Design a protein around this ligand. Structure first.
Ligand code: 4P8
Ligand code: MN
Length: 181
């Protein structure tokens, strides 16, 4: 049918705060949202998932993702100096004060196991916990430890489904799904 604009969709369906943060991210990494619209959408999605993940248990998680890079690294350094946790080589999305480990969160259109393996290879850290969500409800987590209960993760998955099917409703899904990497 009628093909829609990804930028319009992103601005209509994501919270304005999230949008601003995503724009800030893309500016920071030199990417133009006006052209890299799928990347823009993905960054919004990943941000929202990180925030929902944090929100599932307030006072447990420090949020790293969303801050400017220097600020984020400052926070990471602070957490390491305060808790004695090993410094990660790449910027994680969260810190878990309860389990005393950083959390890397992935959101993928690809096969979750493969994606997980790529992440676990590309962090080269050992204590950082990895949690991968797909748009079809699949999950993959380090040591099969999923951290949050089924209801919280169900909320996350449901949001992902909503996004996927509104995109599909606008004819955006086909392009978005294969523009990964
Ligand atoms: O897909 C977008 C995306 C964005 C981010 C945000 C981000 C975090 C750190 C550096 C650059 C960027 Cl774009 C992170 C991940 N990730 O960890 O799977 C992402 O998959
Ligand atoms: Mn990150």
């Amino acid at each position: 049918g009628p093909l829609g604009s990804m930028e319009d969709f992103v601005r209509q369906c994501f919270n304005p705060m999230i949008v601003e943060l995503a724009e800030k991210t893309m500016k920071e990494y030199g990417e133009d949202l006006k052209i890299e619209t799928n990347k823009f959408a993905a960054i919004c999605t990943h941000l929202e998932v990180c925030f929902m993940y944090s929100d599932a248990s307030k006072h447990r998680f420090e949020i790293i993702e969303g801050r400017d890079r220097t600020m984020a690294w400052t926070v990471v350094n602070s957490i390491c100096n305060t808790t004695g946790a090993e410094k990660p080589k790449f910027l994680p999305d969260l810190y878990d004060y309860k389990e005393n480990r950083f959390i890397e969160i992935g959101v993928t259109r690809r096969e979750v196991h493969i994606y997980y393996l790529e992440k676990a290879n590309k962090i080269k850290s050992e204590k950082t916990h990895i949690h991968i969500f797909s748009f079809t409800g699949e999950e993959m987590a380090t040591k099969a430890d999923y951290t949050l209960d089924e209801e919280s993760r169900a909320r996350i998955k449901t949001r992902l489904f909503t996004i996927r099917q509104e995109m599909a409703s606008r004819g955006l899904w086909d392009s978005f799904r294969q523009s990964e990497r």
